[PDB]
């Protein structure tokens, strides 16, 4: 009776808060924390995961929405707008009776009709470079500046078309985003193979490695000593004075094992023996072995070594010795690059060059984070477009045609479910409206123009976010993902039903 | 203290102007008047809004006074005057804060006004008078959008017949004209088409016994404020009249039957209970003179008045139809109809068109309305300001910038965006050489002004601009108000 009204008000408030974010031309919000550090972002997922919401059921909506749509690429803010509009439209009929179950039946029937419509509208144009360009641009211009997105589209699309050779979509490890703080943010490219965070204390050991062999195996040039005896150095410090010694024999054992490894699998000072340590190493043994042609470094994280297993090769055990070099692999180039003060090791052209890392040079922390999120979103969107193989006309093209199909589907359903279907259509109509409003033009001017021209066009058609003119998104380059639409519709219907079925609230 | 009173004055001006900012044009947004008695008032006229509302700030009171004067001087445009004054003061607010004296600002405003007066005449399109075709086009253009839409024929014919019946050739060629000396005869009865025009003055007062030669071939009217008595034991006025031998005498009081026969012997027709508001037009139409001193009496006391008098009785009313008098300067226009609920506004619009014709005689110029003239003068000022030097150039540009408020409001109160339309109008108007495009008021769509066919008299727009600028300088020249409250 009134719990429904409370939920409606909370959902409308959340929708109104998230109104001015949809679309590339939409403005962006900024997040402030108690510490003082601020984040500047526009993506709905991070906004809902970071906002401090007052109303409880609004927090419910945000949490469940993020949880469900983590599976698909994005569309979070569009989903929130559609569910808010659904609730408002249902309220305009509930306020005069209209028991929520009938509205639920109408919603489910409209969902079925919209699913069939989307199935028969989806366009299966064969994949090429140009379509990937268009998808990357559409998915990137909605998270970062215009020209920055234009620069980043080429990098992301080239990386993704490189990845696509496996004929199966895989992600996470195979694409790595490195972060650094060069002033020139315009520098953004891709590096094949691996890029290591940093190296060790080596004065011009190998540099241009060219051909190399990778064994790693967490070398022990600074093998752990026996420092821990009882708490700390007590009056009985002879343990931490002498027992801490005699472990240099481990370091010399590793040195000699690498010695015959190098002059067994190489036979010359060339062909850099690439090894890594998970902790620091002593410069003495390090440069003594590097002067023999061994590429030894230190202080690397795990993710790089697991990537080395699949992209370079070689086992990795901290406690080890010389063993079968069968696991060892080869690298085309292990050249090291330094920008200003910190060293980057470019492990590229290696065996299985499928693994590729992405390079950005953001000036400060928040721009770096926004760039990382934008490139991740673009990668996910293009991967989904690869997987479905059938892109769909965006810019509100599918939504308006879906609304028209639902309206023409009104007499098909009996009972009072027609009211639910009509409300569902009017709610799905929100997306082009929000696009036009965020762009700056009048709401209903653009909406009426688009509907009127789509009446005779037959083909799908969107909105140009530069003049308000209707535009055929198919021929321009605006594209969305089939799976995104599927998951959005399904989750939207589910959450709308769940909220509408509530009757009363009590404490606990 | 100091400039603070100026800021308060201009704030009051801005907050009184924007109240009725949105109520001009063919699609004026309507307003509410809620008296503290529960009543509710339906009103569109901003002049009526300000007349009904009451305000305490003296500057707002002075602006009410100037609005009323402009209403009673030239006619319409009072809302435009108020809007222009408010916008000019609001834009001068920034310069007042700029720590510049009001003297330089008002000097810049004066120079801008001088420039505007010229550039208005530069762009005004010529018009012809008494040319029925496009005069009727003007009637369908501006004299419309009132309650005479279905009855425009009566208004047009009345105006065209009565334009040449109050003209005064005092110092030039019929350029002196008044809308009050005309005999408007607004009586209900019959059909509205019964209204006509006559060359003379009509009196609603008549003798109780018109069984006499009330009309003479050449009446010689002489005004007399004295009332005739039975006799001296005053009869002496009868012999005094007999000395000069007139035939018509006007008095403000009744005449007895014996006194009526005495005046019949005096060979004069006695007219009683006349009204001063009608006696003035009697004297104007007949050229009468009043004198009673016996020493000053001469041959000039009595002069020729009417030419063909007559009295009829229409609608059981004692009419008095003087026609074809000596001077066609105070003639008759008849106003009949079944009801008078709209005919008053009809005659108001008639006097509006009368001012239109009078100023057309003054200056046969029409300005392209609908924001076309405003944008033209703003463009002229902005292009002329490039050569101007010194600090005074900024007000000379801000007055032009603030003058574009009229098309802004026209576009605003029709649904269309007030930004894109204004930008399109300005951008295309500059490159256009002599186009003067004016936005349509109904659809809120750009259109060349000749095709739309709307225009205003040069004199009325000139007066509006002059009053707005003078109000701006007057309100900026106030340095303090403390004389009590």
């Amino acid at each position: 009776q009134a719990a429904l009204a409370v939920n409606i008000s909370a959902a409308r408030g959340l929708q109104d808060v998230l109104r001015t974010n949809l679309g590339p031309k939409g403005t962006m919000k900024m997040l402030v924390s108690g510490a003082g550090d601020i984040k500047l972002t526009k993506d709905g997922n991070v906004l809902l995961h970071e906002m401090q919401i007052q109303h409880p059921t609004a927090s419910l909506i945000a949490k469940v929405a993020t949880a469900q749509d983590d599976i698909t690429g994005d569309g979070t803010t569009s989903n929130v707008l559609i569910i808010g509009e659904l609730l408002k439209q249902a309220d305009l009929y509930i306020s005069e009776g209209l028991h929520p179950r009938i509205i639920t039946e109408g919603f489910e029937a409209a969902k079925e009709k919209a699913l069939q419509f989307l199935e028969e509208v989806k366009v299966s144009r064969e994949m090429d470079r140009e379509t990937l360009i268009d998808v990357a641009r559409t998915s990137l211009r909605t998270k970062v500046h215009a020209e920055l997105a234009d620069v980043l589209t080429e990098a992301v699309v080239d990386s993704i078309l490189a990845i696509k050779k496996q004929d199966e979509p895989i992600d996470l490890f195979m694409i790595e985003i490195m972060e650094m703080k060069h002033k020139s943010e315009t520098d953004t490219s891709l590096i094949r193979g691996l890029v290591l965070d940093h190296g060790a204390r080596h004065p011009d050991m190998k540099k241009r490695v060219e051909d190399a062999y990778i064994l790693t195996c967490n070398v022990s040039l600074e093998y752990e000593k026996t420092e821990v005896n009882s708490g700390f150095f007590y009056k009985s410090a002879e343990e931490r004075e002498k027992l801490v010694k005699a472990e240099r024999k481990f370091i010399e054992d590793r040195v000699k094992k690498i010695i015959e490894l190098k002059r067994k699998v190489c036979g010359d000072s060339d062909k850099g023996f690439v090894v890594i340590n998970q902790k620091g190493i002593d410069p003495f043994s390090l440069d003594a072995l590097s002067k023999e042609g061994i590429v030894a470094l230190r202080r690397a994280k795990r993710r790089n070594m697991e990537r080395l297993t699949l992209a370079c090769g070689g086992v990795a055990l901290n406690s080890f010795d010389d063993l079968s070099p069968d696991c060892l692999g080869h690298a085309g180039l292990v050249y090291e690059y330094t920008l200003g003060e910190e060293k980057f090791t470019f492990i590229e052209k290696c065996n299985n060059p499928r693994s590729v890392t992405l390079l950005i040079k953001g000036p400060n922390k928040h721009t770096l984070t926004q760039i990382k999120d934008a490139v991740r979103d673009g990668l996910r969107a293009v991967k989904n477009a690869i997987d479905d193989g059938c892109v769909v006309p965006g810019a509100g093209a599918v939504e308006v045609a879906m609304a028209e199909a639902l309206i023409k589907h009104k007499p098909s359903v009996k009972g009072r479910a027609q009211l639910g279907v009509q409300a569902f259509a009017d709610a799905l109509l929100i997306i082009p409206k929000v696009l036009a409003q965020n762009s700056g033009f009048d709401l209903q001017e653009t909406l009426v123009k688009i509907q009127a021209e789509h009446s005779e066009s037959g083909q799908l058609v969107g909105v140009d976010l530069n003049t308000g003119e209707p535009m055929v998104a198919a021929e321009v380059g605006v594209w969305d993902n089939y799976c995104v639409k599927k998951q959005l519709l399904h989750s939207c219907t589910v959450i709308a039903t769940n909220i509408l079925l509530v009757d009363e609230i009590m404490r606990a | 203290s100091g400039r603070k009173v100026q800021s308060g004055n201009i704030n009051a001006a801005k907050t009184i102007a924007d109240i009725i900012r949105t109520c001009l044009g063919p699609k004026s947004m309507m307003k509410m008047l809620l008296d503290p008695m529960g009543g509710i008032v339906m009103t569109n006229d901003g002049n009526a809004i300000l007349r009904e509302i009451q305000v305490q700030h003296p500057a707002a009171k002075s602006m009410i006074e100037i609005s009323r004067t402009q209403d009673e001087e030239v006619g319409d445009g009072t809302t435009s005057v108020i809007i222009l004054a408010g916008e000019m003061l609001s834009v001068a607010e920034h310069f007042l804060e700029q720590q510049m004296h009001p003297t330089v600002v008002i000097s810049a405003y004066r120079k801008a006004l001088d420039d505007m007066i010229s550039t208005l005449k530069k762009i005004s399109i010529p018009v012809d008078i008494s040319d029925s075709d496009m005069m009727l086009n003007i009637i369908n253009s501006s004299i419309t959008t009132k309650a005479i839409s279905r009855w425009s024929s009566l208004a047009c014919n009345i105006a065209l017949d009565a334009v040449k019946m109050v003209q005064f050739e005092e110092n030039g060629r019929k350029e002196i004209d008044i809308k009050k000396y005309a005999r408007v005869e607004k009586i209900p009865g019959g059909i509205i088409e019964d209204s006509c025009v006559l060359r003379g003055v009509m009196i609603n007062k008549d003798v109780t016994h018109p069984r006499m030669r009330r009309y003479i071939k050449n009446p010689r009217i002489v005004l007399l404020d004295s009332s005739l008595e039975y006799k001296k034991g005053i009869q002496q006025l009868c012999e005094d009249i007999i000395q000069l031998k007139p035939d018509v005498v006007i008095t403000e009081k009744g005449i007895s039957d014996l006194a009526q026969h005495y005046l019949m012997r005096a060979n004069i027709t006695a007219i009683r209970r006349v009204r001063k508001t009608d006696n003035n037009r009697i004297a104007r139409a007949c050229g009468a003179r009043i004198v009673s001193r016996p020493e000053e009496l001469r041959e000039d006391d009595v002069g020729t008045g009417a030419g063909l008098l007559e009295i009829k009785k229409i609608g059981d009313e004692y009419f008095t139809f003087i026609t074809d008098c000596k001077d066609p300067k105070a003639c008759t226009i008849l106003l009949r109809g079944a009801s008078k609920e709209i005919l008053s506004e009809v005659e108001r619009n008639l006097q509006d068109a009368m001012q239109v014709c009078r100023n057309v005689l003054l200056d046969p110029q029409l300005v392209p309305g609908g924001g076309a003239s405003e944008m033209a003068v703003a463009h002229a000022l902005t292009e002329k300001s490039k050569a101007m030097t010194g600090v005074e150039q900024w007000p000379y540009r801000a007055v032009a910038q603030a003058l574009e408020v009229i098309p802004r409001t026209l576009i605003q109160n029709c649904g269309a965006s007030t930004i894109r339309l204004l930008t399109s109008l300005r951008a295309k108007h500059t490159q256009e050489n002599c186009e003067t495009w004016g936005v349509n008021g109904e659809t809120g769509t750009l259109v060349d002004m000749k095709e739309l066919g709307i225009w205003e008299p040069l004199a009325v727009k000139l007066q509006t601009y002059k009053t707005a600028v003078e109000t701006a300088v007057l309100l900026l020249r106030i340095d303090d108000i403390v004389s009590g409250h």
Binding site: T27, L40, M51 | A427
Partner: protein, 483 residues
């Protein structure tokens, strides 16, 4: 969003006064309750309690500006404030924020492409000490008025011109050492860093010095303990003096036994090292700080060229010169009555050296003192009418925000700003680029800058304009946050 705009506007206003050679300065009090007098706006901001996030990111933009150029930060602040207030009134008109952003971006690109069209660059080279000294006087004149600019330009530039080798320079090479006492006119320039030392037991001509770094500075039973402690201390100083050590550096205090033992080791016991000097010494002599007295290492042992005592400045000091570059290190010794003006003088020295650096990286110079600002404003506002569309409003507002620099420069210098602005703008049609404002005359009079020699870096102004536009754009595109 008007809250953010107003906050940034107040932030810009509170530092607008300090702009120009007539910087009418402020008081500085921090949490630990000092009292400084300073006119440098960059010095003002670093102790302002800025809480509004828009202010936080505008001062972040200012910090980015100073890290790339080194001056004009106050210009960035005032330009951003003008841009944001004009954007505020544009929003009040009814324009969308995105349209304003687009207009500002296109106006910024127009400004960058029009800037290099009025450059009157340097004369011949970084050499000719007098010529470049005349060049580098503008920034220091802005920091400190013309009372001492003529001495300051020679003092600062003469130090940076010591090592014009291979066309490479470093700002950190020219450090500043402060000596209290006589007036500023008694300032001097010297080679090699100058700082206080304690012991005078130093030989003038020395071989390769051995900089011993002190990371950690200093009945019968009483006699026994005293003897043991003295012997331990003597062993410690013997260990310090090992490996051919000849000199030491310490942040501690002298001891009579310690100084005597060091002197009879022919080693001076240098103490009283400032908390900043030791990192610079270590980085310039190619060594590191020795942990204690007993573990010194010759591998991490300091060597620059030699060590001796300089009497310049009416005091005894320590000097290290002739590094691996043999001329890279060159400090400047200053004299002053108090310390509250030492900060301003060293700030002016930095404002000279960084402008010299950007001159090295860009030998192109544009007229200053309101010349370039009004010229670019005129160019952009003339281009605005040509460009149709809705970006035109943002273009004129960008030009108006650009022309606000000479307005503030005139106003905070005493002269009425509007008169100066109007006269300058009217003159600029005929009195072209080189015209500029006159500081001396109270009447609003103008004067050509080419003869005045008041010029500012082309690259500096370029980067300042770019970063101000970026900051204004990134401020305009926010809506709100929980607060």
């Amino acid at each position: 969003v008007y809250r953010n705009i107003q906050a940034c506007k107040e932030l810009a206003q509170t530092t607008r006064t300090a702009y120009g050679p007539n910087g009418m300065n402020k008081m500085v009090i921090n949490h630990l309750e000092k009292l400084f007098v300073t006119n440098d706006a960059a010095t003002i901001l670093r102790e302002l309690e800025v809480q509004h996030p828009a202010a936080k990111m505008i001062v972040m933009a200012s910090h980015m500006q100073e890290q790339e150029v080194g001056d004009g930060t106050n210009f960035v602040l005032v330009f951003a404030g003008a841009l944001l207030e004009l954007a505020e009134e544009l929003l009040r008109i009814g324009l969308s924020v995105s349209e304003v952003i687009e207009g500002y971006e296109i106006a910024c690109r127009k400004a960058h492409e029009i800037l290099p069209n009025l450059v009157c660059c340097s004369a011949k080279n970084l050499r000719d000490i007098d010529e470049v000294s005349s060049l580098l006087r503008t920034s220091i004149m802005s920091k400190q008025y013309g009372n001492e600019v003529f001495l300051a330009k020679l003092i600062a530039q003469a130090c940076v011109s010591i090592f014009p080798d291979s066309g490479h320079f470093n700002v950190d090479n020219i450090r500043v050492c402060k000596i209290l006492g006589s007036g500023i006119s008694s300032s001097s320039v010297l080679h090699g860093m100058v700082f206080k030392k304690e012991t005078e037991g130093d030989v003038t001509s020395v071989k390769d010095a051995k900089i011993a770094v002190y990371s950690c500075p200093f009945a019968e039973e009483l006699m026994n303990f005293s003897k043991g402690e003295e012997n331990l201390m003597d062993a410690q100083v013997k260990a310090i003096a090992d490996t051919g050590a000849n000199v030491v550096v310490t942040g501690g205090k002298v001891a009579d036994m310690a100084l005597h033992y060091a002197n009879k080791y022919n080693i001076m016991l240098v103490r009283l090292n400032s908390k900043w000097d030791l990192r610079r010494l270590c980085k310039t002599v190619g060594a590191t700080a020795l942990p204690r007295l007993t573990p010194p290492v010759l591998e991490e042992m300091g060597h620059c060229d030699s060590v001796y005592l300089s009497e310049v400045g009416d005091t005894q000091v320590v000097v290290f010169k002739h590094e691996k570059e043999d001329g890279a290190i060159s400090t400047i010794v200053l004299r002053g009555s108090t310390d509250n003006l030492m900060d301003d003088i060293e700030r002016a020295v930095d404002d000279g050296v960084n402008t010299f650096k950007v001159l090295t990286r860009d030998k192109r110079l544009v007229p200053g003192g309101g010349a370039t600002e009004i010229e670019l404003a005129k160019q952009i506002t003339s281009y605005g009418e040509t460009c149709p569309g809705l970006e035109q409003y943002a273009i004129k507002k960008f030009a108006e925000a650009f022309e606000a620099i000479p307005r503030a420069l005139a106003e905070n210098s005493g002269v009425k700003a509007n008169e100066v602005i109007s006269k300058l703008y009217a003159v600029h049609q005929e009195g072209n680029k080189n015209v500029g404002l006159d500081i001396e005359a109270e009447v609003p009079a103008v004067k050509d800058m080419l003869e005045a020699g008041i010029l500012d870096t082309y690259l500096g102004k370029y980067w300042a304009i770019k970063l101000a536009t970026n900051a204004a754009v990134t401020v305009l595109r926010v809506d709100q946050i929980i607060m």
